[PDB]
């Protein structure tokens, strides 16, 4: 996950947004390789088990 | 309906002629060669008090 940019002039090319509890915390380039790598940490007791990881392509976030 | 309904707000309009034309010369998007065009022209009383764009866009078009 990449850090959210600071300048208001840099546009988002294809980076999907990351919303942690409704708060924008970062950006991910490829979400299909991000959620699949994040669920493996949840299935190995490296993450909280009561954590919903949703990936929708309609809003790109 | 123009000559029988005064519910439109007054833009100091004395006449409103409508010229039917089957081929208009508006070079914007030539996508329909088998359609007709309707030109609505407002008659002004020798001034520019009607020539604003927002009133024509908001009152004359939905009327």
């Amino acid at each position: 996950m990449e850090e959210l940019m600071d300048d208001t002039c840099t546009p988002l090319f294809g980076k999907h947004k990351v919303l942690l509890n409704g708060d924008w915390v970062g950006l991910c380039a490829d979400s299909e390789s991000f959620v699949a790598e994040l669920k493996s940490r949840r299935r190995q007791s490296e993450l909280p088990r009561e954590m919903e990881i949703k990936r929708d392509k309609d809003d790109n976030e | 309906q123009y000559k029988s309904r005064n519910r439109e707000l007054k833009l100091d309009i004395v006449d409103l002629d409508i010229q039917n034309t089957n081929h208009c010369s508006s070079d914007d998007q030539a996508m329909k060669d088998d359609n007709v065009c309707i030109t609505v022209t407002v008659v002004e009383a020798s001034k520019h008090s009607v020539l604003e764009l927002d009133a024509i866009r908001l009152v004359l078009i939905p009327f």
């Binding site: - | 508006s26 070079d27 914007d28 520019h48 020539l51 764009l53 866009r57």
Partner: protein, 113 residues
């Protein structure tokens, strides 16, 4: 409805017709700049009457009415009285001719006036 952007100000532009030149110009409100317009198009809109967004499918808006039915006729294949009638045109005719469609679910027959 068509909006353009300023060259140096990078703000919105407003259409301003020059009465002394009889042309169309786009003038920036913040910076003193009057750009040359193009094709004299200041408004364009595909007319869509969908002014009730996210509410047209709850109540019956009736944007597609039904065809009327009559029972004073009789079909050719089956001996049914109910039939759907409407008005349309043919492939090369000039006018409007009455058509019929049978209401029987096993008939499948249609005929003209």
């Amino acid at each position: 409805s068509t909006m353009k952007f300023c060259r140096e100000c990078n703000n919105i532009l407003y259409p301003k017709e020059d009465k002394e030149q009889k042309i169309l110009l786009y003038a920036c409100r913040n910076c003193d700049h009057q750009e040359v317009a193009d094709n004299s198009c200041v408004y364009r809109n595909e007319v869509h009457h969908s002014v009730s967004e996210r509410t047209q499918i709850l109540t019956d808006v009736a944007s597609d009415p039904t065809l009327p039915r009559t029972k004073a006729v009789r079909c050719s294949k089956c001996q049914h009285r109910e039939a759907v009638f409407f008005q349309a045109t043919a492939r090369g005719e000039e006018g409007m001719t009455l058509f019929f469609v049978c209401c029987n679910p096993n008939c499948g027959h249609r005929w003209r006036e």
